[PDB]
């Protein structure tokens with residue numbers, strides 16, 4: 001995946017008008033948008049096709065897929081039917097649950113991103129201790145796309161080590177959660193940024209500013 | 219605790235609105251509590267919750283396996299309760315802050331959180347099983363009252379019941395299609411969740427009636 005400016009917008013506004021307006025305001029800076037349940041549950045799955053129609057951007061569906069294999073398969077089918085290019089899946093529920101998602105993605109020409117270690121404090125309780133193993137599991141399963149934590153660059157670096165330089169790694173927790181864009185891009189291919197852009201008085205200027213700060217990395 | 223008719227919750231994971239409504243209507247005399255998940259919601263919209271409420275006298279548990287950071291969890295719970303769900307299922311593996319975010323919204327909005335402890339599928343053995351006793355204990359410490367545990371592992375379901383105590387509410391999927399037994403599961407769970415064994419049956423009503431007949435002495 002080739003992400004413009006190494007910057008993925010996390011569009012977690014919950015109103016269609018605002019989400020479309022803000023995305024439009026930063027469209028010159030990005031070609032990849034992560035849409036999650038805050039927007040989808042508020043406005044419907046049709047929002048994905050609307051983003052494709054208006055912006056042509058890639059859409060990563062951040063659905064943290066975390067069920068049994070049979071249910072995971074159904075979730076992935078519904079998500080790809082709506083036009084998502086990729087889906088984010090949890091590894092904590094185990095290999096069969098991940099494989100179910102990989103199968104549907106292959107069938108529909110899409111990508112699975114595996115969440116390895118989350119960026120919030122609670123991730124320390126259970127996720128962090130399993131994260132290296134979840135990454136190795138991804139490698140064993142042939143997962144090529146991973147998500148790791150901007151808030152812990154030492155952990156992000158370890159995850160990069162496990163998956164290798166050929167795998168694609170994206171990283172949320174930049175800005176609002178405390179992560180630094182440039183430091184994160186030492187290890188991740190792209191950063192995910194939500195609030196620092198979409199809650200800014202001037203989202204375009206916020207996006208521009210982040211990009212300016214990492215210009216030598218582009 | 220919610221009073222689940224016949225100790226039986228329908229897992230309505232059909233993905234077509236017409237089929238989901240037909241099957242649910244056919245079993246409505248047996249079941250007053252329906253679990254609606256992402257297979258149906260992502261196919262038909264959050265308004266499917268409204269339609270179920272309108273058509274049937276059923277409580278709705280939104281099985282959304284909520285598993286994000288606190289800020290995102292809060293938004294998911296708000297949208298879900300806004301749409302009319304009585305309760306939402308959340309994961310514990312993302313940790314206490316993530317669970318607390320859901321509890322806070324549920325408290326504010328007058329709804330309920332169910333905490334997934336150990337899942338019933340084979341993959342649950344890899345990471346979830348080893349965390350599950352602590353996830354349950356974390357739930358107790360946080361004041362969680364409602365829990366989900368695995369029909370497929372009676373020994374684990376029994377231990378999780380012990381951890382959460384007899385006063386907590388425990389529901390259990392994995393019955394039927396995944397191998398779990400209704401009666402054995404109800405030794406520990408307040409109610410069983412059944413999906414495919416009912417909704418893929420030639421006669422879903424007869425399937426539900428048969429399950430209920432088999433546990434009649436436990437009602």
Ligand SMILES: O=c1cnn([C@@H]2O[C@H](COP(=O)(O)O)[C@@H](O)[C@H]2O)c(=O)[nH]1
Pocket residue numbers: 010012036062117118119120147148149172173174175176177192193194195196286287290
């Ligand atoms: O470990 C994490 C942390 N956050 N997110 C998601 O990335 C975005 C971070 O947004 P933010 O820049 O506003 O913090 C939100 O959509 C959040 O659910 C993840 O996928 N994984």
Ligand SMILES: O=c1cnn([C@@H]2O[C@H](COP(=O)(O)O)[C@@H](O)[C@H]2O)c(=O)[nH]1
Pocket residue numbers: 067068071229231255281336337338339366367368391392393394395396411412413414415
């Ligand atoms: O540990 C589990 C196992 N299954 N489920 C959910 O319960 C239902 C089980 O359906 P089934 O009777 O068709 O197996 C499905 O909706 C599945 O996502 C859980 O919530 N937790």
